[PDB]
Amino acid sequence: MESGELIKRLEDAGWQIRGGRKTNSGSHVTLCKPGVRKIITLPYPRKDISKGLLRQAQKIAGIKLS
């Protein structure tokens, strides 16, 4: 799963992109979801994402990613 794929899955779950800031050749995007008092911060682009990361992303977003 790519960074962009993970971002779109989060958007499907109601997370909204706040914007993105320039970085070591790539960037970081932050997302927030109405009613949730958490931020998700992700590097992009990434061609591959670890299951370790995805597992934690599942916990923060409250959805499965597969």
Added chain:
Amino acid sequence: MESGELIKRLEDAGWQIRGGRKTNSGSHVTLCKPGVRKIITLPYPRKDISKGLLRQAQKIAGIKLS
């Protein structure tokens, strides 16, 4: 087990205190064993030592854990 008891178990296995060494966080004790071209470097002094560390000490130095 404390540092002191571990050192005496190492001596029982033929190791000798080489000397202490002091750096920017605490001190250390180095040991050597006659006819062996190896060093053991221990944190010192400690009031408790993990089973993890002890298992490795046995692995390398051949002490009794009792």
Added chain:
Amino acid sequence: MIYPIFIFKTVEGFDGYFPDIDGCFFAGNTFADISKNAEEAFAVHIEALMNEGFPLPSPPKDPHRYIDDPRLKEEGGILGFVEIDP
């Protein structure tokens, strides 16, 4: 200040997150790359928390909290350290 990171092998190199900072993820091709990316992720993430009015994380906890963290065991996670100066 020294912060713990949990990192995981990817095909590109590594990615992971700050175990004390829920939602703060990062990635890099080398260890030097991922430490730079982590600092960047940290700064962007803290400023978002402050802008939104969400809880800010506390400094790193007792070593026992990381040694007992099942997330390391679960997925082949490794503990690393990044220097961050707010």
Added chain:
Amino acid sequence: MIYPIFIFKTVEGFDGYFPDIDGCFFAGNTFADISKNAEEAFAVHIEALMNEGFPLPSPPKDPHRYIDDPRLKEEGGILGFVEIDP
């Protein structure tokens, strides 16, 4: 240089060793002590080896090569890594 370390709990804090460096042990109490004390134990150990003219440890493996190490599983340890430079 990147060195893997194994980390275990004590009542007090933590201790551990460099799996690629037999005989090199470290310990500490706070989270910040982990990388600091690991690195000092290394410096103490290598300098002793060189002082005695004893063989130096073989080059370290990549940290992720130790992810399934039974020593970690058997006594509740975790896998970390530190970057060491002169």
